[PDB]
Amino acid sequence: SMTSHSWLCDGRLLCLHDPSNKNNWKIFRECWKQGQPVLVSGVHKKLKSELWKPEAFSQEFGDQDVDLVNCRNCAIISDVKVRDFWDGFEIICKRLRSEDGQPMVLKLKDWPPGEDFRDMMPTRFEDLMENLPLPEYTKRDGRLNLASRLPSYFVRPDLGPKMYNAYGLITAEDRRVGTTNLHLDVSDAVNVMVYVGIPIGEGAHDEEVLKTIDEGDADEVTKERIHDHKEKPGALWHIYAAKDAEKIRELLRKVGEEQGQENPPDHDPIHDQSWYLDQTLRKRLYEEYGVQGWAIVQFLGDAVFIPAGAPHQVHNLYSCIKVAEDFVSPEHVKHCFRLT
Ligand SMILES: CCOC(=O)Cc1ccncc1
Ligand SMILES: [Cl-]
Numbered sequence: 425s426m427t428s429h430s431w432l433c434d435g436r437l438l439c440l441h442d443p444s445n446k447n448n449w450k451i452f453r454e455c456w457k458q459g460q461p462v463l464v465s466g467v468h469k470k471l472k473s474e475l476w477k478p479e480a481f482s483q484e485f486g487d488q489d490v491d492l493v494n495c496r497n498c499a500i501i502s503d504v505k506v507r508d509f510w511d512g513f514e515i516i517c518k519r520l521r522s523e524d525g526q527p528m529v530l531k532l533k534d535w536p537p538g539e540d541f542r543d544m545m546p547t548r549f550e551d552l553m554e555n556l557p558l559p560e561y562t563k564r565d566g567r568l569n570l571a572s573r574l575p576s577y578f579v580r581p582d583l584g585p586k587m588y589n590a591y592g593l594i595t596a597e598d599r600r601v602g603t604t605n606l607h608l609d610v611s612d613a614v615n616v617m618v619y620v621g622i623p624i625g626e627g628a629h630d631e632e633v634l635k636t637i638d639e640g641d642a643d644e645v646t647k648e649r650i651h652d653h654k655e656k657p658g659a660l661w662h663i664y665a666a667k668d669a670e671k672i673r674e675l676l677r678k679v680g681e682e683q684g685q686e687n688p689p690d691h692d693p694i695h696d697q698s699w700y701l702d703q704t705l706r707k708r709l710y711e712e713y714g715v716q717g718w719a720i721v722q723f724l725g726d727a728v729f730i731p732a733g734a735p736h737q738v739h740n741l742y743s744c745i746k747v748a749e750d751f752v753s754p755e756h757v758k759h760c761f762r763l764t
């Protein structure tokens with residue numbers, strides 16, 4: 425039977441089932457006020473699927489100059505063509521190779537650049553903005569989005585949306601690496617999975633994906649979406665409540681010291697965006713500091729709602745195209761205020 429919602433993370437995470445249900449706000453706002461993330465499934469079924477394919481981006485934009493990042497060592501690949509990224513997205517035999525002769529796991533940096541998404545891609549902009557869930561919160565002019573309404577005493581988000589394009593991590597060693605390291609954002613955001621690319625040539629990398637989800641602390645109900653419904657898993661997230669950010673900084677200062685980093689006692693390891701919490705670090709955070717997070721697997725068409733101030737990290741399981749919009753809900757406006 426169709427139902428309005430269900431729960432993940434053993435009851436701790438709301439999952440809304442119909443992205444365009446006009447009554448979603450009634451269920452959403454109780455969980456959101458408590459500082460929880462929220463998942464909304466099914467957004468892919470609302471979009472024009474031909475606008476969100478890797479081959480389209482390569483054909484239309486391939487001659488643009490860009491920088492890439494090597495996810496394994498954070499090295500910058502400077503001034504290459506955007507087609508050099510897109511043509512290796514799924515076909516492993518086309519990827520740029522490291523000195524060791526292995527295909528690299530790459531992230532496309534700052535593309536489209538700054539605020540240029542709407543000017544560069546007007547049809548994609550319209551397709552995304554008209555199908556975002558919780559539109560009173562997420563649309564630029566929604567009634568519960570304060571972004572356009574606040575004075576300079578508040579940090580205002582840039583005009584969006586922003587795209588996050590990166591290959592999947594592959595090996596046992598890659599399990600300890602981020603696509604994106606732990607950080608936080610002073611505005612709320614909604615992040616939509618618009619495409620998942622499951623590669624070929626090295627096609628059988630499915631068993632290491634199960635061990636990553638299992639060791640990532642994914643709940644038993646999340647594991648059923650793979651084995652029973654055959655949905656495409658894109659990325660593993662860890663999100664932490666905004667109230668736990670300082671305890672996380674204390675853990676990362678202690679580990680920085682143990683590893684022989686030489687850091688002033690007040691430096692900010694979350695703002696530095698230099699850490700990925702692997703299985704060892706997530707267990708130490710729980711045991712030593714009493715902090716529990718949310719382990720979320722984002723499938724094709726899932727929208728992840730990230731509360732302002734909440735630390736989060738992302739580990740792509742397969743190649744992903746994600747598009748995110750920032751907003752300022754009244755529930756979390758304190759996080760962007762510039763005083764006390
Ligand atoms: C969108 C998921 O893909 C990422 O790169 C992670 C990302 C998500 C949230 N904040 C920054 C980056
Ligand atoms: Cl809060």
Ligand SMILES: [Cl-]
Nearest residue numbers: 545546547548
């Ligand atoms: Cl477009």
Ligand SMILES: [Cl-]
Nearest residue numbers: 449558559560
């Ligand atoms: Cl709404």
Ligand SMILES: [Cl-]
Nearest residue numbers: 603604605697
């Ligand atoms: Cl990062």
Ligand SMILES: [Mn+2]
Nearest residue numbers: 607608609736
């Ligand atoms: Mn973020």
